[PDB]
Amino acid sequence: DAIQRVGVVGAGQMGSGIAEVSARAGVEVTVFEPAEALITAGRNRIVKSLERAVSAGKVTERERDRALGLLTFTTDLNDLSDRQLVIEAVVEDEAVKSEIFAELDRVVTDPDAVLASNTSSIPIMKVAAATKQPQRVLGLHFFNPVPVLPLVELVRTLVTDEAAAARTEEFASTVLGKQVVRCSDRSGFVVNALLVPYLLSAIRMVEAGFATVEDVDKAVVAGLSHPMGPLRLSDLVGLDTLKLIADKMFEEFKEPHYGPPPLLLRMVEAGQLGKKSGRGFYTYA
Amino acid sequence: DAIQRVGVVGAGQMGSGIAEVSARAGVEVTVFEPAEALITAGRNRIVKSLERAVSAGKVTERERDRALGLLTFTTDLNDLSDRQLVIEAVVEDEAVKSEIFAELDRVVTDPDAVLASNTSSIPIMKVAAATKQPQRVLGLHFFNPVPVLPLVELVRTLVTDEAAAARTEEFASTVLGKQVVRCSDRSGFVVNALLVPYLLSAIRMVEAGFATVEDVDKAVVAGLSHPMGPLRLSDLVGLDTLKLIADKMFEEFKEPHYGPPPLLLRMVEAGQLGKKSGRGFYTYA
C-alpha cells in the first residue's frame, strides 16, 4: 500500500530537489542518470543544498547524514526495478521523455507502481502512450525550491488508474507534507496557466513604454502584497523557461495573449535570460 | 509649494479611507457630501476605523483625537474654496463626476490648486474636459484599505500641468508616506490592468470544472506565496466592481480575455457580490 521505495530520473535543479525532499522525509531513494558525470553533478547539488540547510539551523548534522544515507546513485536502469514510485525530471523534449517511459515501463514490474512526470510543457497522455500499461502514468508537478514550497499538482490523464492517483496523493500529503492540487491534462495545469499570462502582460506594459520596470514591480508589491513584482519574478523563473511555456500555451489554446511578446523574444535571443545569466529586466553581480 | 489644506468629496468606504489617512498625517481635511445623512455615515466609518485601530495597539489615545480634531464635515461645497488639493471618490458614473468637477473648478479659485479623481472606470480626460482649467486635473488612485496599502497611482492626462503632478507626488510621498507609481490615462492604469485579467482567468477555470474554487486558491497561496488566492480576492474586491472594470477594459481594448465570463455575469445578476452581500465564491456568516 504505502510508498517506501522512490526512484528519480534526472539530477538537474528539480530532480535534485525531489530526491532531497524524499530522503529528508525518510524514504529510500535511487537516483538514475545515464552517465557518471551527471550522477556526480546531482550528488553535489544535494550535498551543497543540505550543507546550506545545516549552516542556517533548519536541519541537524545527524539529519543531513541520515538523508545522505538513504540516497543511492546509479547508471544502471535495472536498479529501479523494485521502485513503487518513479519521478522523471529530465530535459523538456518529447522524444527523450517517450524513450525513458518505454524503458521504465519494462523495468519497473510491480503492478501497483506509479510512473510520474514533472513536465510543465509535454502533455501527460503523450508520455503515458509510450508505455504498455498507460493506467500507471500521471503528472506530479513540483515547484523550485522543492524542499521549501509546500505544493504539488497531481494531473490525471484520460486513463490514469484511480488507485494509482490515490496512492500518489497520500504519499505527497502524508510523507512529503505537501498540499495536493488536482487538475486535468491541459497545457500549464493550474499554477503556470495563471502565472505566465500575468507575467507576459507585465512585459507588454514595459515594452510599450507605459510604465518602467521599477514602477510595475513597485505597484505590484505595495498594491497587491506579492513578495516580488512580475519582472523580478520573470528574471527568477528564467526568460528562456518563460518563452517555452508561453510557446506551448499558444500552441494548445491559440489565443494571442498566451504568445511571447517581441521584447521577451529579443532578450532570449541576446542571451539575457535573467538571474542565471547575469541579466534580464535587472542586472545581477 | 506644500499642501496643508485637503478636501475630500464623498464619504463611502474609499473617501472615508482617504480622509482618515490625511488627518492622521496631520493635514486639515474638509469632507463634503450633499445630504446630512451621508455625513453621519462617514464620521462613524472613521471613528469605528480609528477605534478598531486603537483596539489593536496602532495609535496613541490623543493621536486619535488629534486626527478627529483635523476633520470637518460640510454639506456646502463652497467651504472647499480654500483647498490646495481636492480628491473626489463618489459613485462611478460619468454624468455625476462631470457635474461635481464643473462646480469644483468654479469654487476652487487658486490656479496652483489640484483637482484629483479616485475613479477606476472613467477616463481622467473626460472629467477634466468638464472644467475650464483642465491642466489642474489628474488621477490619484488609492487602494482599500487606504490606511494600510502604501501605494497611489498618479495618472496624468494629455494636458495635466507638470507643476500640478510634481506637487501631488510630493504630497503622497512626503505627507502620506505612500509609494507613487506614474502612468498614462488608459483603462485599468497599472494595478487593475494586471490584477483583473488574472482574476477573470481563475473564474473561467472554475466555470469549466477544470479545478475547484478551493484547489485554485490553495495552489496560488502555496505555489506563488500570495496572501490570498484569486477567488477569495474576487469576493473581497466585490464581483460588481470586478464586472465594471472588466466591461470598461473590454470597451477600451476589445480583446475577449478582458470581458467578464458568463459565470461572473450570472453571479452579479443574482446579487452574489462577495463578502459585502454574504456570498460569492465563498459564504460569509
Numbering used by the authors:
A (entry chain A), B (entry chain B): 3 to 287
Q: How does the study describe this entry?
A:
Recent evidence shows that Mtb degrades host cell cholesterol during persistence and that the inhibition of cholesterol degradation could provide a potential route to control the growth of Mtb in macrophages. The cycle begins by introducing a double bond between C2 and C3 (α and β positions), which is followed by hydroxylation (step 2) and hydroxy dehydro­genation at C3 (step 3); the cycle is completed by the thiolytic cleavage of 3-ketoacyl-CoA to give acyl-CoA and acetyl-CoA (step 4). In contrast, FadB2 (Rv0468) and FadB3 (Rv1715) are smaller, monofunctional enzymes that encompass only a hydroxyacyl-CoA dehydrogenase (HAD) domain.
We have now determined the crystal structure of apo Mtb FadB2 at 2.1 Å resolution. For instance, Ser122, which is essential for catalysis, maps onto Ser137 of HsHAD, while the strictly conserved His143 maps onto His158 of HsHAD. The solvent-accessible surface (SAS) buried upon dimerization of FadB2 is ∼1500 Å per monomer. Overall, the structural analysis of FadB2 in terms of fold, tertiary structure and the conservation of amino acids that are observed to be in contact with the ligands in the human mitochondrial orthologue is entirely consistent with our previous enzymatic characterization. Firstly, the multi-catalytic FadB cannot dimerize in the fashion of the monofunctional enzyme; secondly, FadB2 cannot replace FadB in the trifunctional FadA–FadB complex as it lacks the hydratase domain.
